[PDB]
Amino acid sequence: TTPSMEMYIEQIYMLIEEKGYARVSDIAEALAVHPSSVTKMVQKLDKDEYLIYEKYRGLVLTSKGKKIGKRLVYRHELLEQFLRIIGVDEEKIYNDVEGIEHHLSWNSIDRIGDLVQYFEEDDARKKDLKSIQKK
Amino acid sequence: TTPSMEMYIEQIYMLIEEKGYARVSDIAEALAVHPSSVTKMVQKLDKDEYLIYEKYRGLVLTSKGKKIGKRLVYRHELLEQFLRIIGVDEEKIYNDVEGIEHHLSWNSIDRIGDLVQYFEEDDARKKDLKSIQKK
Ligand SMILES: [Mn+2]
Ligand SMILES: [Mn+2]
Numbered sequence: 063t064t065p066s067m068e069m070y071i072e073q074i075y076m077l078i079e080e081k082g083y084a085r086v087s088d089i090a091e092a093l094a095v096h097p098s099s100v101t102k103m104v105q106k107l108d109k110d111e112y113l114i115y116e117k118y119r120g121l122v123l124t125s126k127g128k129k130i131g132k133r134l135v136y137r138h139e140l141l142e143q144f145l146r147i148i149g150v151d152e153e154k155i156y157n158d159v160e161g162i163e164h165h166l167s168w169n170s171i172d173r174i175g176d177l178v179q180y181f182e183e184d185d186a187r188k189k190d191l192k193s194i195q196k197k
Numbered sequence: 198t199t200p201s202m203e204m205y206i207e208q209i210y211m212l213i214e215e216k217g218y219a220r221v222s223d224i225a226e227a228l229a230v231h232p233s234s235v236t237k238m239v240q241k242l243d244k245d246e247y248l249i250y251e252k253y254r255g256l257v258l259t260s261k262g263k264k265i266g267k268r269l270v271y272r273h274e275l276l277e278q279f280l281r282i283i284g285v286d287e288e289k290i291y292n293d294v295e296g297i298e299h300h301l302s303w304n305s306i307d308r309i310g311d312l313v314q315y316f317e318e319d320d321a322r323k324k325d326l327k328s329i330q331k332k
Binding site: 145148149150151154157158161162165166167169170173174176177179180187190191194195 | 280283284285286289292293296297300301302304305307308309311312314315322325326329330
């Protein structure tokens with residue numbers, strides 16, 4: 063895959079999960095791009111077997127597409143949770159996540175998950191961390 | 198400064214610190230860019246006053262450029278320290294830092310800094326974190 067392919071797979075997965083389908087116009091709306099650009103990427107994703115077109119349902123993810131898709135959403139949400147946990151201003155988070163999500167190895171994602179769990183199981187840790195920043 | 202600009206200033210700052218000069222050939226090899234493209238970017242940085250020609254030394258950082266370069270190197274080093282502290286495979290750290298450093302807000306950088314010193318003040322916290330990775 064590529065960062066762009068992942069940006070699209072993530073968005074398509076989100077729409078199907080939210081609406082039950084992923085229309086070109088909806089994808090174009092979420093990414094602020096022309097539908098023709100969407101169709102070009104969809105053709106590529108079809109060629110690479112991440113999805114297929116079904117007569118009425120339209121765009122449908124293959125098993126490969128759904129598995130990766132769910133993990134891309136996982137990554138995005140974990141990174142948002144990570145930044146939120148360490149005190150980053152809410153207004154900054156989405157921009158930072160989108161800027162780094164496609165450039166962080168899964169090993170790093172794995173370790174970040176352990177870091178988030180670390181603070182999740184004991185608020186005294188979040189308190190000690192917070193005492194460092196305001197200081 | 199744009200991410201591309203920061204990428205160049207960071208590398209130029211480093212070359213000057215280690216060699217005393219930043220030759221196009223050394224810049225091109227370190228950034229994996231052809232010397233032709235370096236030349237074009239350097240001409241722009243010179244015009245934008247981030248770089249300036251000096252007798253004997255050649256292309257050097259201006260006061261504006263050196264101040265920025267110092268910040269960029271700080272950011273890179275802090276990010277390497279961060280990933281190393283949370284357990285990221287040593288062989289994957291550099292690529293990740295390289296891919297996220299230009300896309301993170303300074304807010305996130307400062308909060309990562311708080312996290313780094315959080316673990317640095319008590320080895321017990323590091324052990325508590327590693328135990329999570331173990332399981
Ligand atoms: Mn995302
Ligand atoms: Mn760097």
